[PDB]
Paper text:
Gram-negative bacteria use TonB-dependent transport to take up nutrients from the external environment, employing the Ton complex to import a variety of nutrients that are either scarce or too large to cross the outer membrane unaided. The Ton complex contains an inner-membrane motor (ExbBD) that generates force, as well as nutrient-specific transport proteins on the outer membrane. These two components are coupled by TonB, which transmits the force from the inner to the outer membrane. Here, we identify a conserved motif within TonB that we term the D-box, which serves as an attachment point for ExbD.
Essentially identical structures are seen for the complex in two different crystal forms; in addition, these structures are highly similar to one recently published, which describes a 2:1 complex of the ExbD periplasmic domain with a 23-mer TonB peptide that includes the D-box sequence. The D-box peptide binds within this groove and, as hypothesized, assumes an extended conformation, forming a strand that is recruited to the edges of the beta sheets of both ExbD monomers. Residues 60 to 62 of the peptide interact with residues 130 to 134 of one ExbD chain (Chain A), forming a parallel pattern of inter-strand hydrogen bonds, while residues 57 to 59 of the peptide interact with residues 130 to 132 of the other ExbD chain (Chain B), forming an anti-parallel hydrogen-bonding pattern. Thus, a single D-box strand is simultaneously recruited to the edges of two different beta sheets, one from each of the ExbD protomers. In particular, the side chains of Ile-57, Val-59, and Met-61 all point downward and are captured within hydrophobic cavities formed in the cleft between the two ExbD protomers. Met-61 lies at the C-terminal end of the D-box, and the hydrophobic pocket containing its side chain is partially formed by the side chain of Leu-132, offering an explanation for why the L132Q mutant fails to bind the D-box.
Numbering used by the authors:
A (entry chain A): 61 to 134
B (entry chain P): 55 to 63
C (entry chain B): 62 to 133
């Protein structure tokens, strides 16, 4: 199934595809795209300045939701 | 509690 | 046996307790893994380390064939 791109910007704004998301809404927005298929590949991209704490907060939300196929892009 | 990642290019 | 790669806020880097830089990291790692590319590498970093830095390190590991990466 079609991969989803999650983008985090320097302002810490976050997007699933083009949809603005936050930690509390990201899994609902993602499930709209994946129809709950946990084998869908998630590609994470971030502005060069985004820090590791932010990255890990996003990764943990995906992980606790069962989205385990993650690729980092840069 | 690790998260596995691939890097793509 | 897994290896821990640490990146600190000042961008200093370590393989185990061994200081490394991007140009020496793979030699230092091979000394621990004996070249076994299925060895798990755990990446840990200070909260303020930037994504650019993380990706420079990930790319060096990736181009060397170390593909089993866990973020901590």
């Amino acid at each position: 199934e079609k991969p989803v791109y999650l983008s985090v910007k320097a302002d810490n704004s976050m997007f699933i595809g083009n949809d603005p998301v936050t930690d509390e809404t990201m899994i609902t927005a993602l499930n709209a795209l994946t129809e709950g298929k946990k084998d869908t590949t998630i590609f994470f991209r971030a502005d060069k300045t985004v820090d590791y704490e932010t990255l890990m907060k996003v990764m943990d939300t995906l992980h606790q939701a069962g989205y385990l196929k993650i690729g980092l892009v840069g | 509690q690790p998260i596995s990642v691939t890097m793509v290019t």
